[PDB]
Design a protein around this ligand. Structure first.
Ligand SMILES: CC(C)(Oc1ccc(CCOc2ccc(/N=N/c3ccccc3)cc2)cc1)C(=O)O
Length: 260
């Protein structure tokens, strides 16, 4: 409950975040800005560069989508491992652990996705490639509409200039949301989130002392996340109806089953 308890929690989460997520914001920024700690990506900006890129790194929009499913499944695996490290999470009723993961994992995906983006495109294939926003926008409907709202969010989110240590606490706050539909015991979840929110506030005060009220502004961003999810779900429903040769991977299918 004291500051030292809050710092210890911040430290624990950052340590777990680094252990759980092999591609950090620090690495993403090093790739994107040309630092010598990391290597230059191959840039895919049209159909030709895409074909050459697969060699360097079934309509194309569908192949890209199926690749997205696999990255997303990996993301869920990483996020689940991380969630289990949040103090108190694995002590919750198992139904609630499942519910929290079900509603939270994509909110986390879009949050961390911002780390891989700038206004012009997104890192892919563990940072080995970079696919432009213009190219993704050019994919046939409805595949061309998947990424744009995520890019719009990312530009706004990236303006906050958070680092990995900040993000570690923020994503924990997202997971421990007491307002998820169908939760059985809201209070112990809120008890954990209250601790995480305090730890995040202190972390932001110490790590960005010249960023006044960064905490409140960060919380402002969480509104956009649920809207991204809502819009995304509508696009998935279209795909389900128009592309019968495809289904979501079973883990993703479970996540979206009876969501909202
Ligand atoms: C059906 C599916 C897969 O639809 C999606 C379509 C597009 C997107 C956005 C781009 O896909 C990404 C997949 C993984 C990403 N990042 N990886 C991590 C890993 C660990 C932690 C955080 C992020 C980024 C983008 C997403 C989904 C779906 O809804 O699952």
């Amino acid at each position: 409950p004291e500051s030292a308890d809050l710092r210890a929690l911040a430290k624990h989460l950052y340590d777990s975040y680094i252990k759980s997520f092999p591609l950090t914001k620090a690495k993403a920024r090093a790739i994107l800005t040309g630092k010598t700690t990391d290597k230059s990506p191959f840039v895919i900006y049209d159909m030709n560069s895409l074909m050459m890129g697969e060699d360097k790194i079934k309509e194309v929009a569908i192949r890209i989508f199926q690749g997205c499913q696999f990255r997303s499944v990996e993301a869920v695996q990483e996020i689940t491992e991380y969630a289990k490290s949040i103090p108190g999470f694995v002590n919750l009723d198992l139904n609630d652990q499942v519910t929290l993961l079900k509603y939270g994992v994509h909110e986390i995906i879009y949050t961390m996705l911002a780390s891989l983006m700038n206004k012009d495109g997104v890192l892919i294939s563990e940072g080995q490639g970079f696919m432009t926003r213009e190219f993704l926008k050019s994919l046939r409907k409805p595949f061309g509409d998947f990424m744009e709202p995520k890019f719009e969010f990312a530009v706004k989110f990236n303006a906050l200039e958070l680092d990995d240590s900040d993000l570690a606490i923020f994503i924990a706050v997202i997971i421990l949301s007491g307002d998820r539909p169908g939760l059985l015991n809201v209070k112990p979840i809120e008890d954990i989130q209250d601790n995480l929110l305090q730890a995040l506030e202190l972390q932001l005060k110490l790590n960005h002392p010249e960023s006044s009220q960064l905490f409140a502004k960060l919380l402002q961003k969480m509104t956009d996340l649920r809207q991204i999810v809502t819009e995304h779900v509508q696009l998935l429903q279209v795909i389900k109806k128009t592309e019968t040769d495809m289904s979501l991977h079973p883990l993703l299918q479970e996540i979206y089953k009876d969501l909202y």
